[PDB]
Paper text:
Kinetochores, multisubunit protein assemblies, connect chromosomes to spindle microtubules to promote chromosome segregation. The 10-subunit KMN assembly consists of three complexes, the 4-subunit [name] complex (MIS12C), the 2-subunit KNL1 complex (KNL1C), and the 4-subunit NDC80 complex (NDC80C) (Bharadwaj et al., 2004, Cheeseman et al., 2004, De Wulf et al., 2003, Desai et al., 2003, Kline et al., 2006, McCleland et al., 2003, Nekrasov et al., 2003, Obuse et al., 2004, Pinsky et al., 2003, Westermann et al., 2003, Wigge and Kilmartin, 2001). Human MIS12C (also known as MIND complex or Mtw1 complex in Saccharomyces cerevisiae) contains the [name], PMF1, [name], and [name] subunits (synonyms are reported in Table S1A).
In addition, we report the crystal structure of the isolated Head2 domain determined at 2.0 Å. The helical connector joins Head2 to the stalk, but Head2 itself is less restrained, as its linkage to the helical connector is extended and apparently flexible. We speculated that the detachment of Head2 from the core of the MIS12C might, at least in part, explain our difficulties in obtaining well-ordered crystals of MIS12C. Thus, Head1 is necessary, but not sufficient, for high-affinity binding of MIS12C to [name]-C. As expected, we saw no binding of Head2 to [name]-C. Thus, Head2 and the segments that precede it (also deleted in the MIS12CΔHead2 construct) are not required for [name]-C binding.
Author numbering:
A (entry chain D): 116 to 197
B (entry chain E): 24 to 99
Write the structure that this text describes.
């Protein structure tokens, strides 16, 4: 069901890269479940929502690249704890 | 090299994570992009829709990772 998201991300990729991909797929997933409940009331066109949502998806992809190089994503795979 | 049996091909496609807290902090950072959707949302449904979108976003990530081979809700 919802586990299709990680099943659809190549396992030939490093696991930290797969986490970055999973972040974007989850963002797009939550977009797509919200969109059918939006209608063209004045001041809020679905066209403008898709423009804002797709613009944010590309900013998120850049943001995740930054988290991949500054070590933040890598912390999800480290343990020096009990 | 030849010693031992070989591992069977991968069957668990969830991202194999080790730190539940680090994932939570990553989700907090990415949560800012969900909030930015509120601009395009109408005031009528904005607040409940953003809570719903945030929870859907965090659920999709959490259900697609393992914490030390365990499910998210059963790990620490």
């Amino acid at each position: 069901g919802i586990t299709e998201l990680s099943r659809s991300i190549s396992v030939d990729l490093a696991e930290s890269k797969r986490l970055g991909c999973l972040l974007l797929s989850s963002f797009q997933f939550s977009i797509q479940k919200l969109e059918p409940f939006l209608r063209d009331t004045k001041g809020f066109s679905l066209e403008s929502f898709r423009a804002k949502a797709s613009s944010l998806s590309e900013e998120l992809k850049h943001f995740a690249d930054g988290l991949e190089t500054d070590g933040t994503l890598q912390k999800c795979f480290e343990d020096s704890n009990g | 090299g030849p010693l031992g049996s070989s591992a069977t091909p991968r069957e668990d496609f969830r991202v194999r994570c080790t730190s539940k807290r680090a994932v939570t902090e990553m989700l907090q950072l990415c949560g800012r992009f969900v909030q930015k959707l509120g601009d395009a949302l109408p005031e009528e449904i904005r607040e409940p829709a953003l809570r719903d979108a945030q929870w859907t976003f965090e659920s999709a990530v959490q259900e697609n990772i393992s914490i030390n081979g365990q499910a998210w809700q059963e790990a620490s």
